[PDB]
Design a protein around this ligand. Structure first.
Ligand SMILES: [Cu+2]
Length: 105
């Protein structure tokens, strides 16, 4: 098991570059049992676990899950695609979103 800090010291923030998080994930093999940790200041960002469509269009309403208090720690316990976005402001629209593929432990 591996523990990942989404974004690095950049943490979970509004990116200057729209592909930042695509870049951060790349080269990482997320497996079942691994844990993602999103760090941010209270109210400045958040985490909503969404479907692929909601991910693509940045739909904030009807999350699978939604978390607001800062480290949001999520364990990956199923194989397959997982999508996360920040619903605060225009953050998702400018790239604060994460797409990963979880494989076996
Ligand atoms: Cu945000």
């Amino acid at each position: 098991m591996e523990d990942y800090d989404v974004g690095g010291d950049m943490e979970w923030k509004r990116p200057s570059d729209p592909k930042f998080y695509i870049t951060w994930a790349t080269g990482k093999t997320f497996r079942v049992g691994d844990e993602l940790e999103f760090d941010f200041a209270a109210g400045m960002h958040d985490v909503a676990v969404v479907t692929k469509d909601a991910f693509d269009n940045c739909k904030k309403e009807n999350p699978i899950s939604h978390m607001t208090t800062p480290p949001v720690k999520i364990m990956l316990n199923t194989t397959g695609p997982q999508y996360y976005i920040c619903t605060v402001g225009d953050h998702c629209r400018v790239g604060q979103k994460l797409s990963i593929n979880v494989v076996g432990a």
